[PDB]
Design a protein around this ligand. Structure first.
Ligand SMILES: CN(Cc1cnc2nc(N)nc(N)c2n1)c1ccc(C(=O)N[C@@H](CCC(=O)O)C(=O)O)cc1
Ligand SMILES: N[C@@H](CCS)C(=O)O
Ligand SMILES: [Zn+2]
Length: 761
């Protein structure tokens, strides 16, 4: 009987219960008792769901109040000393590490900054960086409760035997970093210090009744130095024994084969591999399995929302079985379901035809169960036919296939992805048209939204005000924002984006080929969740998406007004993508759609246009090689397809917040980049690059208003390495999140600073 397995379950709650209780706890509205009770209710509900679905191997320890990686840091005492000085209980040290701590002045006021949040591989999840010192003393924090033991026992008392999930020692160290007081520390060097702590944990788990543990080593999908590769043998020889559970060494998101020698002689009880991302590694990883080791075949996607093709997924599982035996194969999710929304049944608005194409986390439980039944030999012909019916329906739908878009993709060529002239030529035309001063000043697009704008957006959404009346409210807010920038002397203006509530959905809703959810929430970081759009079909742009507000904003000033678009790569990366066509094709369709928009802005007199690509690094393939170099190429091509239809005197800006070669490949006239927190070398990499650059002069995610003189010095430092003729002056990013008084004196200072450089030059 081939078993089914789930690597982890989203913990947020089908009604975002976990957000609501954690935020109430942080705001003082809930007690720690109420927090802990809600966490227990969620874990019970999710274990029972899984048990009811028939899943054999059910996870525990996959729950968290903030981040599972930080949970391990608390558990092993990797807690920087600065957090321990406030008589905080362990849960509150946890939350301090994750989200910072502010305490009144007595001493000057406390503001302890959170530990760094880091992207978890190429997922859209973020973890809290494990942070280590020379003095770090790893040990089990017994008084804090031992989370994996306690949750295991909690499950067992409900009659649900689980498999605890922990991040393994190699990955945990390797993904961490040295704290500021220990900059010469290599985290992996600490392996002999942490191994005993994992061994004690594992002993305690075995003593509690856990017979198997899922031990995640996802760094096996990265390019690993040889000296790191040898550490798996060291680590797992130490851990495996009679006194601990069986270990299933678990990998996801990529290809382990370059590291196969590292895991070919381990004493573990089995492995898990991701055959959704890399089905082609099956043969080779199957080939190294020892006698009795088992193979967990990850065939239900943990990172996207499409209904699994049961035939194709069973076929992958069957190839494994043919190599190693029915007795030694498990059917699994490819990764944790952390990366999927909770339940498709919550959607109130999607048409049944489209819903039929989808499976969210709750549905994926049934999938792994049915697939394991099918390969075990049970008659699930009904479920298979029903599944094959669904698959076939999507394949043929006109929603998926738009022949006009297909025809347009064939038109893509070098000319479509190249400006009419190179930058030096273009610059001559732009100097004639705009005559911008040296050290031109600008901002990134968004400004603080009033309370009245947010109330009116709600009222418009109910028809309580007419479209005409909402437009008037938005234009009034644009006027205010333009008037402000004029009075303080900014040279290239923006409209403040009051009409936009999200950088991707604002465009998706106006594009064909997209579907949206009502409750499709995924954890991004802590209690901050995203509800990604879904790309369902071929993408096109029926009409103007942004032109009206930008033309209004340009109409009330003689200063150049930036139009403002999210780039194709970001819209793709922050959506659930199609799994039937490449990311490349999706990005090029998005590039063509955005080209119509750039073209329409230019035509309407908006001849300065910025394209925001915050998510460019985020799709970077995980290993060096052809995939990675292809991605950088198509990512740049898709941006160039969006932007290369314009006249030479039209000024294209790109905002990033990356490899300088890639930046240069976009051939933007002006770039802005987050830069206020680095190497003076990267700056010199664009010494001889003619196109212009604005390095962010202050942190928009903080609010400590820099003086005029503070700006002058930050600029003098860049000028030592960078010519004055190319330098633009701007903030790090948009100002949507900041308050007006901070915005106003900071901006006023920034301009006053630039003008001093204009006098000197
Ligand atoms: C790191 N980051 C940038 C980010 C990441 N992924 C995205 N994904 C999508 N689809 N759209 C975005 N605008 C987006 N932005 C984030 C992530 C979460 C929140 C956040 O606060 N979410 C709100 C709700 C977000 C919303 O309503 O759109 C919440 O309270 O849970 C903000 C910024
Ligand atoms: N134009 C956007 C960019 C966000 S990356 C803003 O200023 O908010
Ligand atoms: Zn930004």
């Amino acid at each position: 009987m081939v078993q089914s397995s789930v690597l982890g379950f989203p913990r947020i709650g089908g009604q975002r219960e976990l957000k609501k209780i954690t935020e109430a706890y942080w705001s003082g509205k809930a007690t720690v008792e109420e927090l802990l009770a809600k966490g227990k209710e969620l874990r019970e509900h999710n274990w029972k769901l899984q048990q009811k679905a028939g899943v054999d191997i059910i996870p525990s320890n996959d729950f968290s109040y903030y981040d599972q990686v930080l949970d391990l840091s608390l558990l092993f005492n990797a807690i920087p000393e600065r957090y321990t000085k406030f008589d905080l209980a362990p849960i509150d040290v946890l939350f301090a590490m994750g989200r910072g701590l502010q305490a009144a002045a007595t001493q000057a006021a406390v503001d302890v900054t959170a530990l760094e949040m880091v992207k978890w591989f190429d997922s859209n999840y973020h973890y809290v960086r494990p942070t280590f010192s020379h003095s770090t003393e790893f040990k089990l924090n017994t008084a804090a409760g031992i989370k994996p033991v306690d949750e295991f026992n909690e499950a067992k008392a409900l009659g649900v035997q689980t498999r605890p999930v922990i991040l393994g020692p190699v990955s945990y160290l390797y993904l961490g970093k040295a704290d500021k007081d220990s900059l010469d520390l290599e985290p992996i060097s600490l392996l002999p210090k942490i191994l005993p702590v994992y061994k004690e944990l594992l002993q305690k788990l075995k003593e509690a009744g856990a017979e198997q543990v899922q031990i995640d080593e996802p760094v096996l999908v990265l390019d690993l130095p040889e000296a790191v590769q040898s550490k798996f043998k060291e680590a797992y020889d130490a851990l495996v024994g009679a006194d601990v559970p069986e270990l299933i060494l678990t990998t996801y998101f990529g290809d382990v084969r370059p590291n196969l020698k590292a895991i070919e002689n381990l004493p573990v009880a089995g492995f898990h591999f991701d055959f959704v991302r890399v089905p082609e590694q099956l043969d080779e990883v199957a080939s190294i399995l020892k006698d009795g080791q088992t193979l967990s075949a990850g065939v239900v996607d943990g990172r996207n929302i499409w209904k699994t093709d049961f035939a194709k997924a069973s076929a992958v599982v069957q190839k494994a079985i043919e190599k190693v035996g029915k007795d030694k194969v498990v059917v699994a999710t490819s990764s944790s379901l952390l990366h999927t929304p909770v339940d498709l049944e919550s959607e109130t608005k999607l048409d049944a035809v489209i819903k039929d194409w989808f499976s969210f986390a709750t549905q994926k439980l049934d999938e792994v169960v049915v697939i394991a039944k099918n390969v075990s030999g049970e008659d699930v012909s009904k479920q298979l036919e029903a599944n094959a019916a669904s698959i076939k329906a999507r394949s043929e739908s006109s929603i998926t296939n738009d022949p006009k878009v297909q025809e347009r993709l064939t038109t893509i060529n070098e000319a479509l992805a190249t400006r009419k002239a190179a930058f030096p030529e273009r610059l001559t035309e732009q100097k004639a048209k705009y005559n911008l001063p040296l050290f031109p000043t600008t901002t990134i697009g968004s400004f603080p939204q009033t309370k009245d704008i947010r109330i009116n957006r709600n009222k418009f959404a109910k028809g309580q005000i007419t479209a005409e009346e909402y437009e008037a409210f938005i234009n009034k807010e644009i006027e205010t924002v333009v008037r402000f920038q004029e009075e303080i002397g900014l040279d290239v203006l923006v409209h403040g984006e009051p009409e936009r509530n999200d950088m991707v959905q604002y465009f998706g809703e106006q594009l064909n080929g997209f579907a949206f959810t009502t409750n499709g929430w995924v954890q991004s970081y802590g209690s901050r969740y995203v509800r990604p759009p879904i790309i369902v079909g071929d993408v096109s742009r029926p009409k103007a998406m942004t032109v009206k507000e930008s033309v209004y904003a340009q109409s009330i000033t003689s200063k150049p007004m930036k139009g403002m678009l999210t780039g194709p790569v970001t819209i793709l990366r922050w959506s659930f993508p199609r799994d039937d066509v490449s990311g490349k094709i999706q990005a090029l369709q998005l590039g063509l759609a955005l080209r119509d928009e750039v073209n329409d802005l230019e035509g309407a007199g908006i001849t300065v246009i910025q394209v925001d690509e915050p998510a460019i690094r985020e799709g970077l393939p995980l290993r060096a090689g052809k995939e990675r170099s292809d991605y950088l190429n198509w990512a740049a091509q898709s941006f160039r397809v969006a932007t290369s239809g314009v006249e030479n005197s039209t000024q294209i800006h790109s905002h990033f917040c990356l490899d300088p070669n890639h930046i240069k490949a976009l051939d933007a006239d002006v770039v802005s980049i987050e830069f206020s927190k680095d190497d003076p070398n990267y700056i010199q990499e664009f010494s001889e690059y003619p196109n212009h650059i604005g390095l962010g002069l202050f942190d928009i995610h903080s609010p400590r208003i820099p003086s005029k003189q503070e700006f002058v010095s930050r600029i003098e430092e860049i000028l030592k390495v960078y010519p004055a003729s190319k330098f633009w002056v701007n903030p790090d990013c948009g100002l949507k999140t900041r308050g007006w008084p901070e915005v106003k004196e900071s901006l006023t200072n920034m301009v006053e600073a630039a003008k001093e450089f204009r006098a000197k030059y």
